[PDB]
């Protein structure tokens, strides 16, 4: 019947006005008007502008709703876990310009790698869903890469449109834009990594899919989980420096054994990944560019395949890390739970083995170029990326094992592993005692 | 180009300004005690006249600077000074040394002098605020300092036995000066009269400084006798008393300043001063301010550029309303967008 | 003494295969795709002297194309020698190594100590040449053309970056050339001068004039074709000749009618008796007997 809204006073009525104008088209059924408004509240709080305390739905004889608003500047700052020993971020955010709208300004310098990293984030909701929402980003890094000893300056804009399905699987698609300035090479660099010293564009375009059924990302004990990294640079009416197609699928899971709920939960983890390089402009059939390191793959580390160095496991010139074009990746877990101690503590004993595989892509075979040496045909393309894709599964992976102390914050993931190295390749750089390892994304 | 980085665009009884006296000298730059000398040995007193000034009081924004009073034109910098008012290896020999002591003597003095931070707070800059009005010296001996400091690199040498490294770097450019025979008539080298000017100016100010860390003028004093011979004897000849029986404007060399220093014009230079280092629109004000100075010099020289550019003000403008209107905008926010109760009915 | 397995490694990427894999040194120049295959003068002079000196030192050695940002140090012109290893290459030999690399029996005439009469005329090179040729090419509106085409158009093909790339290459030559006092040396702020209103433009041009005219007459003195009479050029000639090159090369134009303003080509034509266009054809005669593509 009639239906008030108290204490909402940032918010326009055309926002909160697509919402419960839907409710009172209802023209003795007690209970589908209960479902609806709380159909109604739940899309309300969907929007992340009011505090969870403030809900209050006072019945009357009808309807009568309370929200307390949050506070629109919020200024933070701390300690985040970007996959990195630390970072000191700082953190301004506006709440709610018009109405659902917000602007994140973060500015975290870090003596560890990042010694700055500027952000401007704006972000609306499109059309009244609280799910899909539009962001216009704006950035400018300087990173320092020390397996592939040099530094790289991002300065460029995205735009992302991200998209919350009714199952829990969220889309995205983002044209980004970049600059990806190469510098700051250190006496110990190969000429590899002095090839490519200097400026880029790399106007892409990459969607993202993911579909975490997983009921602990921290700490998985079932479930599963399956992620799509897609990207498009260059080719058609994008333009930039460089051209390529470059895909990514990660998949997960974990099965519980018996003894009650003894957490148990033997894991799983499978990687792949391809980088295609593309002709420039609106064809298939073209000469095209070898890839960049700024581009290429890079496996080995702590988060990723657990028992070598930062960079390891790929093409090595001297020391430095440069990259692949097509990856392969995967583990196995056993998680067992610790004694004295129920299935509770977010402590577990890991006992893990991972496998990798990070292989270039040449053009042997078809070298009858001579002069203008770089661009390269459909042909010598395809059949490169013929001869990578048998070069993963041409002998026994880059391969480690060890255990480990599994620590499970609801924010990252902290595992501290004794590793040994078991199967390599020459100049590969596997590390054989313990190693710390801190963050989200794990393999 | 943003029309700031360009040539610019052309349509289709003289008075020294200098610096003021210091350390028994008639100047404290060595440009300036080039250009007095220059000016005392050719002209005659009845014929120009000295003006104590400052960067700021001049449009050139380079001290040593003629105003011609018969076209009204202003001329900066010493080479352009003596190629105004003006066998063939002596002129060779002339503009290679003038190069050499412009590019690898200047240097030297400033590690001496400007980047020794026991020199400089002890000896230099005292004698650079007593020339200045009295707020004036909080705002350009820093820039003079910091100009001279950027000319002092590419030595690798600093404030911080590594005392060789100084005496190295101060015998390659002694051994190179010391083969001229600059207080001679004959034998060896034979230069010009101006680069003689130039040698006096930067040698003694070298040699002659009351320094309390005296690591020039002993290497000056024990290895290269000639040099020091040479600085006493031209001093005792062009400069006696000191630099006082100089022609200075209004009677002094201190009363020669109060012309162009007035409560309205010495407010301006120190404001001026202060706006080129807000942080943002500092940059654009200084660029903007030193084009406009360019434009009026040129009017003077002869020439007769195109003016109308102001994107550098409207730049800087921009940027400084851009952050102040964000920051408003966000800060104090707007309005409120609705109110506390909003009753939706059921209609008919 | 785990590693249980060890393979022969990976190979490298394909673009590292064709661009570092040579079998004579490689010395990284300003140089474009078309002169580095044949192995023409660089278009930066501060390159071509190194160039040069490689060349009158016999060395066989390759040029390719690169920017600053790979060099060792700062600043361009260095050597990386040939692998040995197909994933293992030396150290890489900066400019103030290139002539102890080289050794090529005796080249103690490259590697000398001048006279100090000869550093007073080398200050004129390094000084009152350079800061000409600062102004007239990055700062002249003339030369913005053949500016964008040496240097910022290899950078990319976007055209806000190659804008940012011009804009920051233009603020570091105006800030060098305000800090040499011929016409420059200002004092307006804090910071450094890094624009074209704080030079004085005509100071710059009569020191180059009169640089130009002491250079020939010295060379006049000389009497056995290089410079204060060797047999051989030294690194004098070298230095000399990477800014009279490119002066005959990029700055010779016919714009000199209705400016005034004799440009930096026809000023090095011009000076004294003709004593430097002349040794400038007698040193490509010698350091590129080959080639007969020059005047322009």
């Given at each position: 019947?009639?239906?008030?809204?108290?204490?909402?006073?940032?918010?326009?009525?055309?926002?909160?006005?697509?919402?419960?104008?839907?409710?009172?088209?209802?023209?003795?059924?007690?209970?589908?008007?209960?479902?609806?408004?709380?159909?109604?509240?739940?899309?309300?709080?969907?929007?992340?502008?009011?505090?969870?305390?403030?809900?209050?739905?006072?019945?009357?004889?009808?309807?009568?709703?309370?929200?307390?608003?949050?506070?629109?500047?919020?200024?933070?700052?701390?300690?985040?876990?970007?996959?990195?020993?630390?970072?000191?971020?700082?953190?301004?955010?506006?709440?709610?310009?018009?109405?659902?709208?917000?602007?994140?300004?973060?500015?975290?310098?870090?003596?560890?790698?990042?010694?700055?990293?500027?952000?401007?984030?704006?972000?609306?909701?499109?059309?009244?869903?609280?799910?899909?929402?539009?962001?216009?980003?704006?950035?400018?890094?300087?990173?320092?890469?020390?397996?592939?000893?040099?530094?790289?300056?991002?300065?460029?804009?995205?735009?992302?449109?991200?998209?919350?399905?009714?199952?829990?699987?969220?889309?995205?698609?983002?044209?980004?834009?970049?600059?990806?300035?190469?510098?700051?090479?250190?006496?110990?660099?190969?000429?590899?990594?002095?090839?490519?010293?200097?400026?880029?564009?790399?106007?892409?375009?990459?969607?993202?899919?993911?579909?975490?059924?997983?009921?602990?990302?921290?700490?998985?004990?079932?479930?599963?989980?399956?992620?799509?990294?897609?990207?498009?640079?260059?080719?058609?009416?994008?333009?930039?420096?460089?051209?390529?197609?470059?895909?990514?699928?990660?998949?997960?899971?974990?099965?519980?054994?018996?003894?009650?709920?003894?957490?148990?939960?033997?894991?799983?983890?499978?990687?792949?990944?391809?980088?295609?390089?593309?002709?420039?402009?609106?064809?298939?059939?073209?000469?095209?560019?070898?890839?960049?390191?700024?581009?290429?793959?890079?496996?080995?580390?702590?988060?990723?395949?657990?028992?070598?160095?930062?960079?390891?496991?790929?093409?090595?010139?001297?020391?430095?890390?440069?990259?692949?074009?097509?990856?392969?990746?995967?583990?196995?877990?056993?998680?067992?739970?610790?004694?004295?101690?129920?299935?509770?503590?977010?402590?577990?004993?890991?006992?893990?083995?991972?496998?990798?595989?990070?292989?270039?892509?040449?053009?042997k075979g078809t070298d009858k170029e001579g002069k203008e040496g770089l661009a390269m045909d459909s042909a010598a393309?395809?059949?490169?990326?013929?001869?990578?894709?048998?070069?993963?599964?041409?002998?026994?992976?880059?391969?480690?094992?060890?255990?480990?102390?599994?620590?499970?914050?609801?924010?990252?993931?902290?595992?501290?592993?004794?590793?040994?190295?078991?199967?390599?390749?020459?100049?590969?750089?596997?590390?054989?005692?313990?190693?710390?390892?801190?963050?989200?994304?794990?393999? | 180009?943003?029309?700031?980085?360009?040539?610019?665009?052309?349509?289709?009884?003289?008075?020294?300004?200098?610096?003021?006296?210091?350390?028994?000298?008639?100047?404290?730059?060595?440009?300036?005690?080039?250009?007095?000398?220059?000016?005392?040995?050719?002209?005659?007193?009845?014929?120009?006249?000295?003006?104590?000034?400052?960067?700021?009081?001049?449009?050139?924004?380079?001290?040593?600077?003629?105003?011609?009073?018969?076209?009204?034109?202003?001329?900066?910098?010493?080479?352009?000074?003596?190629?105004?008012?003006?066998?063939?290896?002596?002129?060779?020999?002339?503009?290679?040394?003038?190069?050499?002591?412009?590019?690898?003597?200047?240097?030297?003095?400033?590690?001496?002098?400007?980047?020794?931070?026991?020199?400089?707070?002890?000896?230099?800059?005292?004698?650079?605020?007593?020339?200045?009005?009295?707020?004036?010296?909080?705002?350009?001996?820093?820039?003079?300092?910091?100009?001279?400091?950027?000319?002092?690199?590419?030595?690798?040498?600093?404030?911080?036995?590594?005392?060789?490294?100084?005496?190295?770097?101060?015998?390659?450019?002694?051994?190179?000066?010391?083969?001229?025979?600059?207080?001679?008539?004959?034998?060896?080298?034979?230069?010009?009269?101006?680069?003689?000017?130039?040698?006096?100016?930067?040698?003694?100010?070298?040699?002659?400084?009351?320094?309390?860390?005296?690591?020039?003028?002993?290497?000056?004093?024990?290895?290269?006798?000639?040099?020091?011979?040479?600085?006493?004897?031209?001093?005792?000849?062009?400069?006696?008393?000191?630099?006082?029986?100089?022609?200075?404007?209004?009677?002094?060399?201190?009363?020669?300043?109060?012309?162009?220093?007035?409560?309205?014009?010495?407010?301006?230079?120190?404001?001026?001063?202060?706006?080129?280092?807000?942080?943002?629109?500092?940059?654009?004000?200084?660029?903007?301010?030193?084009?406009?100075?360019?434009?009026?010099?040129?009017?003077?020289?002869?020439?007769?550029?195109?003016?109308?550019?102001?994107?550098?003000?409207?730049?800087?403008?921009?940027?400084?309303?851009?952050?102040?209107?964000?920051?408003?905008?966000?800060?104090?926010?707007?309005?409120?967008?609705?109110?506390?109760?909003?009753?939706?009915?059921?209609?008919? | 003494?785990?590693?249980?397995?060890?393979?022969?490694?990976?190979?490298?990427?394909?673009?590292?295969?064709?661009?570092?894999?040579?079998?004579?040194?490689?010395?990284?120049?300003?140089?474009?795709?078309?002169?580095?295959?044949?192995?023409?003068?660089?278009?930066?002079?501060?390159?071509?002297?190194?160039?040069?000196?490689?060349?009158?030192?016999?060395?066989?050695?390759?040029?390719?194309?690169?920017?600053?940002?790979?060099?060792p140090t700062g600043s361009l012109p260095f050597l990386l020698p040939p692998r040995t290893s197909p994933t293992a290459?030396?150290?890489?030999?900066?400019?103030?190594?290139?002539?102890?690399?080289?050794?090529?029996?005796?080249?103690?005439?490259?590697?000398?100590?001048?006279?100090?009469?000869?550093?007073?005329?080398?200050?004129?090179?390094?000084?009152?040449?350079?800061?000409?040729?600062?102004?007239?090419?990055?700062?002249?509106?003339?030369?913005?053309?053949?500016?964008?085409?040496?240097?910022?158009?290899?950078?990319?093909?976007?055209?806000?970056?190659?804008?940012?790339?011009?804009?920051?290459?233009?603020?570091?030559?105006?800030?060098?050339?305000?800090?040499?006092?011929?016409?420059?040396?200002?004092?307006?702020?804090?910071?450094?001068?890094?624009?074209?209103?704080?030079?004085?433009?005509?100071?710059?041009?009569?020191?180059?004039?009169?640089?130009?005219?002491?250079?020939?007459?010295?060379?006049?003195?000389?009497?056995?074709?290089?410079?204060?009479?060797?047999?051989?050029?030294?690194?004098?000639?070298?230095?000399?000749?990477?800014?009279?090159?490119?002066?005959?090369?990029?700055?010779?134009?016919?714009?000199?009618?209705?400016?005034?303003?004799?440009?930096?080509?026809?000023?090095?034509?011009?000076?004294?008796?003709?004593?430097?266009?002349?040794?400038?054809?007698?040193?490509?005669?010698?350091?590129?007997?080959?080639?007969?593509?020059?005047?322009?």
């Amino acid at each position: 019947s009639t239906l008030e809204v108290h204490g909402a006073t940032n918010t326009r009525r055309s926002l909160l006005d697509q919402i419960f104008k839907p409710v009172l088209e209802d023209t003795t059924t007690l209970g589908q008007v209960l479902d609806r408004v709380g159909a109604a509240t739940k899309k309300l709080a969907r929007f992340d502008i009011f505090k969870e305390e403030g809900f209050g739905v006072f019945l009357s004889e009808d309807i009568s709703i309370r929200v307390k608003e949050k506070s629109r500047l919020v200024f933070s700052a701390g300690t985040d876990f970007g996959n990195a020993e630390g970072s000191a971020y700082t953190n301004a955010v506006v709440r709610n310009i018009f109405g659902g709208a917000e602007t994140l300004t973060v500015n975290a310098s870090t003596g560890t790698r990042t010694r700055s990293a500027y952000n401007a984030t704006f972000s609306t909701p499109i059309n009244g869903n609280p799910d899909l929402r539009l962001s216009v980003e704006a950035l400018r890094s300087a990173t320092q890469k020390p397996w592939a000893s040099h530094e790289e300056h991002l300065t460029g804009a995205n735009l992302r449109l991200a998209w919350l399905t009714e199952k829990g699987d969220t889309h995205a698609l983002a044209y980004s834009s970049v600059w990806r300035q190469l510098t700051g090479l250190a006496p110990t660099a190969s000429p590899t990594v002095r090839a490519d010293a200097g400026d880029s564009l790399k106007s892409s375009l990459t969607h993202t899919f993911t579909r975490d059924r997983r009921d602990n990302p921290m700490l998985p004990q079932s479930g599963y989980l399956f992620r799509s990294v897609s990207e498009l640079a260059g080719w058609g009416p994008l333009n930039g420096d460089v051209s390529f197609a470059k895909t990514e699928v990660e998949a997960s899971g974990a099965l519980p054994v018996a003894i009650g709920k003894s957490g148990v939960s033997v894991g799983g983890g499978l990687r792949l990944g391809v980088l295609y390089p593309l002709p420039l402009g609106y064809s298939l059939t073209g000469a095209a560019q070898p890839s960049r390191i700024n581009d290429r793959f890079q496996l080995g580390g702590p988060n990723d395949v657990r028992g070598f160095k930062i960079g390891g496991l790929g093409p090595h010139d001297g020391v430095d890390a440069v990259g692949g074009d097509v990856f392969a990746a995967g583990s196995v877990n056993a998680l067992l739970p610790l004694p004295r101690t129920g299935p509770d503590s977010p402590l577990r004993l890991q006992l893990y083995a991972n496998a990798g595989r990070l292989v270039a892509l040449n053009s042997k075979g078809t070298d009858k170029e001579g002069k203008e040496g770089l661009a390269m045909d459909s042909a010598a393309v395809f059949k490169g990326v013929k001869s990578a894709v048998g070069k993963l599964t041409n002998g026994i992976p880059s391969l480690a094992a060890g255990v480990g102390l599994v620590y499970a914050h609801p924010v990252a993931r902290f595992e501290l592993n004794f590793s040994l190295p078991l199967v390599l390749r020459r100049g590969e750089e596997g590390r054989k005692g313990l190693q710390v390892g801190v963050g989200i994304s794990f393999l | 180009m943003s029309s700031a980085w360009s040539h610019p665009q052309f349509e289709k009884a003289v008075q020294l300004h200098v610096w003021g006296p210091a350390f028994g000298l008639p100047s404290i730059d060595a440009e300036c005690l080039a250009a007095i000398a220059y000016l005392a040995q050719t002209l005659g007193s009845a014929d120009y006249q000295l003006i104590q000034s400052s960067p700021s009081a001049v449009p050139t924004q380079h001290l040593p600077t003629l105003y011609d009073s018969r076209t009204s034109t202003w001329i900066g910098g010493f080479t352009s000074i003596t190629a105004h008012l003006h066998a063939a290896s002596a002129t060779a020999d002339g503009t290679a040394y003038t190069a050499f002591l412009s590019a690898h003597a200047a240097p030297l003095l400033a590690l001496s002098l400007y980047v020794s931070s026991a020199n400089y707070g002890a000896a230099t800059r005292p004698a650079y605020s007593a020339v200045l009005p009295l707020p004036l010296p909080w705002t350009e001996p820093p820039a003079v300092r910091a100009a001279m400091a950027r000319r002092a690199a590419h030595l690798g040498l600093s404030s911080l036995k590594s005392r060789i490294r100084l005496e190295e770097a101060a015998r390659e450019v002694l051994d190179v000066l010391a083969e001229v025979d600059w207080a001679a008539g004959g034998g060896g080298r034979q230069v010009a009269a101006e680069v003689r000017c130039l040698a006096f100016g930067y040698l003694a100010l070298m040699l002659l400084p009351d320094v309390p860390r005296p690591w020039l003028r002993e290497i000056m004093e024990g290895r290269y006798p000639a040099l020091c011979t040479f600085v006493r004897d031209f001093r005792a000849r062009v400069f006696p008393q000191g630099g006082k029986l100089l022609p200075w404007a209004d009677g002094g060399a201190q009363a020669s300043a109060s012309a162009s220093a007035s409560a309205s014009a010495v407010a301006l230079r120190f404001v001026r001063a202060v706006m080129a280092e807000v942080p943002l629109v500092g940059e654009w004000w200084s660029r903007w301010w030193t084009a406009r100075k360019k434009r009026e010099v040129l009017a003077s020289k002869g020439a007769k550029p195109a003016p109308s550019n102001d994107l550098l003000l409207l730049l800087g403008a921009g940027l400084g309303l851009t952050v102040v209107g964000a920051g408003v905008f966000f800060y104090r926010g707007l309005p409120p967008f609705g109110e506390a109760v909003q009753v939706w009915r059921k209609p008919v | 003494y785990f590693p249980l397995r060890i393979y022969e490694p990976n190979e490298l990427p394909e673009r590292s295969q064709q661009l570092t894999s040579g079998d004579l040194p490689t010395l990284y120049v300003f140089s474009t795709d078309s002169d580095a295959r044949l192995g023409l003068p660089s278009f930066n002079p501060g390159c071509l002297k190194w160039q040069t000196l490689l060349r009158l030192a016999n060395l066989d050695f390759r040029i390719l194309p690169s920017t600053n940002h790979s060099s060792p140090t700062g600043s361009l012109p260095f050597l990386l020698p040939p692998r040995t290893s197909p994933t293992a290459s030396p150290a890489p030999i900066p400019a103030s190594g290139l002539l102890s690399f080289a050794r090529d029996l005796d080249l103690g005439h490259l590697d000398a100590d001048l006279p100090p009469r000869a550093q007073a005329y080398l200050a004129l090179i390094t000084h009152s040449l350079r800061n000409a040729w600062l102004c007239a090419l990055y700062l002249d509106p003339t030369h913005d053309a053949l500016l964008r085409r040496l240097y910022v158009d290899p950078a990319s093909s976007s055209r806000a970056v190659r804008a940012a790339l011009l804009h920051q290459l233009r603020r570091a030559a105006a800030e060098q050339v305000a800090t040499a006092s011929s016409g420059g040396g200002k004092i307006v702020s804090l910071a450094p001068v890094d624009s074209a209103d704080g030079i004085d433009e005509e100071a710059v041009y009569r020191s180059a004039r009169d640089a130009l005219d002491a250079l020939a007459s010295l060379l006049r003195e000389s009497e056995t074709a290089w410079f204060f009479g060797t047999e051989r050029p030294g690194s004098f000639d070298a230095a000399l000749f990477s800014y009279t090159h490119l002066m005959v090369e990029y700055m010779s134009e016919e714009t000199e009618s209705a400016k005034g303003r004799v440009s930096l080509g026809r000023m090095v034509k011009e000076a004294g008796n003709g004593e430097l266009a002349e040794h400038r054809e007698r040193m490509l005669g010698v350091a590129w007997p080959e080639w007969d593509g020059y005047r322009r």
